[PDB]
Amino acid sequence: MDHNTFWFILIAFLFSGYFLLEGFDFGVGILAPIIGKDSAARNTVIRTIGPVWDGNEVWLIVAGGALFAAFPEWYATMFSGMYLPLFLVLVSLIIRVVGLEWRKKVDDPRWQKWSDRAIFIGSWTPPLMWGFIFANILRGMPIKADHTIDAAAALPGMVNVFAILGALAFTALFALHGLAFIRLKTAGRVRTDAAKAAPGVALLAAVTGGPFVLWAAIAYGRSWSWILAVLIIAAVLGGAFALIKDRDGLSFLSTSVAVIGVVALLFSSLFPNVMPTTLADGVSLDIWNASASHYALTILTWTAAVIAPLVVLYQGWTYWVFRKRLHAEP
Amino acid sequence: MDVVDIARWQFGITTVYHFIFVPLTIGLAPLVAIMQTFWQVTGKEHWYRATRFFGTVLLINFAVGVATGIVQEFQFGMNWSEYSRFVGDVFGGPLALEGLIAFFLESVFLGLWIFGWGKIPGWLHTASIWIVAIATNISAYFIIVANSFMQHPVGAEYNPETGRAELTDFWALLTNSTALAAFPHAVAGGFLTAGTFVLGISGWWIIRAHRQSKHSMHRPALWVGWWTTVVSSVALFITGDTQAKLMFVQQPMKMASAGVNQLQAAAEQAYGPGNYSPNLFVTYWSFRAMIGLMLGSLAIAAIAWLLLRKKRTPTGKIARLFQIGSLIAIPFPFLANSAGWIFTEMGRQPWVVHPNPESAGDARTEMIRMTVDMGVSDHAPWQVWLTLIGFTILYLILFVVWVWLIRRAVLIGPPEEGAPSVEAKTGPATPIGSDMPMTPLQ
Numbered sequence: 001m002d003h004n005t006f007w008f009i010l011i012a013f014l015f016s017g018y019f020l021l022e023g024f025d026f027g028v029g030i031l032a033p034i035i036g037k038d039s040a041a042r043n044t045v046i047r048t049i050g051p052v053w054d055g056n057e058v059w060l061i062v063a064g065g066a067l068f069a070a071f072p073e074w075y076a077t078m079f080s081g082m083y084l085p086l087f088l089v090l091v092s093l094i095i096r097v098v099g100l101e102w103r104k105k106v107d108d109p110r111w112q113k114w115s116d117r118a119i120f121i122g123s124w125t126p127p128l129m130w131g132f133i134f135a136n137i138l139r140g141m142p143i144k145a146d147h148t149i150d151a152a153a154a155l156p157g158m159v160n161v162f163a164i165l166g167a168l169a170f171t172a173l174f175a176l177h178g179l180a181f182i183r184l185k186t187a188g189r190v191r192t193d194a195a196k197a198a199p200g201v202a203l204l205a206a207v208t209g210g211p212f213v214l215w216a217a218i219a220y221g222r223s224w225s226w227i228l229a230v231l232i233i234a235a236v237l238g239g240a241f242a243l244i245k246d247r248d249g250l251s252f253l254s255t256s257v258a259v260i261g262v263v264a265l266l267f268s269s270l271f272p273n274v275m276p277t278t279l280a281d282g283v284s285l286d287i288w289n290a291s292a293s294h295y296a297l298t299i300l301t302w303t304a305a306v307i308a309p310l311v312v313l314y315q316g317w318t319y320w321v322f323r324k325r326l327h328a329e330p
Numbered sequence: 331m332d333v334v335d336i337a338r339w340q341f342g343i344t345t346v347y348h349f350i351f352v353p354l355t356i357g358l359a360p361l362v363a364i365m366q367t368f369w370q371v372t373g374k375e376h377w378y379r380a381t382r383f384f385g386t387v388l389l390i391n392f393a394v395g396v397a398t399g400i401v402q403e404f405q406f407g408m409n410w411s412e413y414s415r416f417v418g419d420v421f422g423g424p425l426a427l428e429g430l431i432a433f434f435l436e437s438v439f440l441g442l443w444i445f446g447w448g449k450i451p452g453w454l455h456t457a458s459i460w461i462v463a464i465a466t467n468i469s470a471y472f473i474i475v476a477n478s479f480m481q482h483p484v485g486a487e488y489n490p491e492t493g494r495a496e497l498t499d500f501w502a503l504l505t506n507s508t509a510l511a512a513f514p515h516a517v518a519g520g521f522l523t524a525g526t527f528v529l530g531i532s533g534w535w536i537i538r539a540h541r542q543s544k545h546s547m548h549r550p551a552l553w554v555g556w557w558t559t560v561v562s563s564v565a566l567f568i569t570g571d572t573q574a575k576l577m578f579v580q581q582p583m584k585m586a587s588a589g590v591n592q593l594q595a596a597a598e599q600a601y602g603p604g605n606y607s608p609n610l611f612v613t614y615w616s617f618r619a620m621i622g623l624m625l626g627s628l629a630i631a632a633i634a635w636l637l638l639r640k641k642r643t644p645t646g647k648i649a650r651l652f653q654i655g656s657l658i659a660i661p662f663p664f665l666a667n668s669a670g671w672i673f674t675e676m677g678r679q680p681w682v683v684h685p686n687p688e689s690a691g692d693a694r695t696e697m698i699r700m701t702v703d704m705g706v707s708d709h710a711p712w713q714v715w716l717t718l719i720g721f722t723i724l725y726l727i728l729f730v731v732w733v734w735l736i737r738r739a740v741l742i743g744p745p746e747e748g749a750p751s752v753e754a755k756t757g758p759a760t761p762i763g764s765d766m767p768m769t770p771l772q
């Protein structure tokens with residue numbers, strides 16, 4: 001295939017790795033004060049993602065950088081049009097960074113409660129606002145002839161039913177993903193508490209993502225987009241089901257398939273376009289008018305093919321080192 | 331005030347906050363790795379205590395360094411879309427490589443260092459901290475390659491069809507003389523920061539312990555910091571001299587601000603009418619500040635050597651003056667790094683991508699220039715005001731908590747233990763105050 005198609009697929013892969021790894025991250029963060037109900041339990045829940053959340057954050061960093069290098073026009077238009085939503089994502093991410101890293105610098109209840117507030121904000125805002133952003137990307141934006149979005153007139157238009165439903169769907173999906181992750185990476189009473197809170201998280205995922213995934217597949221997708229949406233819904237159901245059957249390995253795998261399917265749907269229903277225009281006079285961005293040079297794509301392809309597999313290898317080795325399930329002291 | 335200057339202020343504030351914390355990481359990850367290697371090979375307990383103490387400081391600094399970093403990468407396209415379009419072909423490659431190699435290495439292996447003490451062999455733990463140090467240096471290199479393309483664009487050709495500078499020589503971009511000169515200098519700046527910090531804290535604690543085995547870690551750590559400070563000062567002098575020679579040729583307007591009228595005339599008669607000079611005051615005082623604060627670090631190093639020779643320890647009012655001098659000298663390299671980068675970015679003005687002087691004749695590369703007014707994403711000013719205020723307040727809170735938390739860790743002092751203990755689950759990465767209230771009782 002062309003290099004443009006290859007780098008569209010690579011950006012989709014980077015965003016899927018992000019939304020997958022940072023997805024359980026946000027699920028663990030959201031469900032820490034919901035499942036914990038206790039300092040010992042909440043600390044173990046946060047400790048599940050402690051050693052590996054920085055790498056998950058990096059995946060986002062690389063998604064942004066590679067979308068800047070492969071598709072500069074896409075990077076500029078998406079990030080300038082969606083200014084304030086991205087600002088909210090970034091503020092919550094900063095607050096989560098400090099809330100997670102500084103959590104153990106002080107052994108005091110006031111410090112821990114402020115850390116919990118930081119973790120709450122940084123685990124709730126990013127899923128919501130990423131769903132908002134990506135639903136608006138798929139629906140379309142007021143893109144002009146110069147590939148520029150006003151972002152002040154476009155902001156009220158962004159607040160629509162499809163974007164709100166996407167936000168809720170992303171939050172529910174990442175909550176289910178983090179729940180399956182907690183089931184996989186904990187032992188003792190914390191795991192049982194996660195099982196106790198499984199029904200509510202599942203129901204919300206099934207009732208919000210399903211409508212959203214089907215709507216996005218049908219209205220703005222292709223003829224097989226409904227097939228992909230059915231796969232996503234079935235993956236969510238299997239993940240919720242495998243959790244009940246104590247298949248915490250298979251539950252996390254199924255919710256993983258669900259998240260990657262959501263990303264694959266959002267990008268395949270977008271391809272070949274990269275930024276659908278809502279203005280008739282304006283021009284939509286695709287993998288050709290919004291792209292880097294062939295030489296730049298060649299250099300990027302070489303470096304990415306050489307380095308990214310090694311990154312995945314040693315990150316997986318780290319996840320293997322920290323494979324042992326955590327326990328909660330009384 | 332219009333959106334351009336608000337966006338400039340936001341970028342400046344956010345990334346000045348970021349490089350408040352970057353140099354300490356750049357210098358201290360290597361120093362912590364060195365201290366832990368010493369503990370591994372020599373076996374002495376005081377090296378383990380030094381590892382724990384300065385690794386506590388390192389982890390606090392690394393935390394605030396990551397968040398400010400996150401905003402900078404996105405801020406690029408959020409606030410400077412036209413810039414992000416003109417250069418993303420050639421500028422975005424170094425950013426992608428930085429994230430893919432250096433950020434992944436440092437994040438993954440610092441997670442291992444913080445959490446995987448007994449889960450891996452101790453030599454592999456020291457390898458993890460060494461990898462984090464090397465990865466921080468690599469990230470410095472790739473970021474500096476990107477900024478040096480901004481300062482001195484090479485390896486790019488203008489494409490009139492896309493109206494955009496496009497990558498045509500990857501090797502010329504990576505081995506840009508501006509990048510190859512500015513990278514060692516930023517590394518030596520980070521090392522000066524960390525060495526000054528270690529030296530000041532260790533001298534303060536030597537005096538404090540004398541006034542009050544368990545504190546035996548201060549003198550070896552003091553000498554580690556002393557050697558780091560001296561070597562980094564020499565490296566800074568050499569690399570800054572190299573960069574001065576480069577800046578003479580590539581960016582005559584920067585040094586003329588550190589003649590300005592002749593260069594302004596040539597600029598307006600080559601790129602059209604308009605101001606083409608930086609802020610003379612800010613440039614002048616940043617450059618001088620980038621120097622005087624190094625003078626301060628050297629002063630503290632010399633005084634520490636004078637007072638602490640031959641295992642000596644001051645006992646009079648000299649001891650109190652030495653403690654005060656150490657604590658006062660600690661912020662000097664942070665301010666020096668900030669001043670140097672402020673000089674760089676303000677003297678870059680009014681260009682977000684500077685016109686390469688050698689590229690003037692070449693038509694196929696003469697259009698790689700861009701100004702700051704033409705590179706900003708057009709926003710309603712209330713949005714930029716909102717983001718600037720939010721970032722400034724959040725960063726002020728983070729910096730205040732950071733100072734408080736390092737002060738708490740330092741005041742707690744070195745760990746009583748000299749070797750990791752299965753009980754209390756402590757290791758070379760455990761923070762000093764991890765088992766103490768917000769205000770420790772003693």
Ligand code: HDD
Pocket residue numbers: 054057058061345348351352353355356391392395396397398399400401402403404433436437465466467469470471473474516517
């Ligand atoms: C000379 C060194 C240097 C310079 C000039 C910069 N940085 Fe930086 N950055 C680092 C050196 C560094 C680091 C030292 O490697 C940090 C700080 C602490 C850390 O963990 O990594 C880092 C972290 C860091 C992170 C966190 C990613 C992660 O580790 O998870 C991001 C997203 C950025 N930076 C982005 C930037 C951007 C967009 C810059 C310019 C506009 C920039 N940095 C200037």
Ligand code: HEB
Pocket residue numbers: 337338339341342343345346348349410413473474476477480668671672675676679681682702
């Ligand atoms: C390339 C990459 C990069 C980098 C690395 C950097 C790094 C840095 N930086 Fe930068 N910037 C940039 C890119 C960049 N940058 C840009 C693009 C801009 C836009 C233009 C202007 O604003 O100037 C800025 C801008 C800017 C500013 C503002 C100025 C004006 O006026 O405008 C400042 C202050 C700064 C500082 C800084 C620092 C300190 C540092 C160290 C860390 N900054």
Ligand code: HEB
Pocket residue numbers: 511512513515516518519520522523566567569570571573574575577584620621622623624663666667668670671673674677
């Ligand atoms: C660390 C601390 C420090 C120090 C000490 C120093 C010291 C010094 N220095 Fe520096 N810088 C710095 C930090 C610093 N620094 C920085 C940060 C910067 C930015 C980046 C670069 O550039 O590289 C600079 C930069 C820089 C430059 C260039 C600028 C531009 O780029 O434009 C020069 C020329 C120099 C010189 C010098 C000298 C001569 C000295 C002696 C005094 N500096």
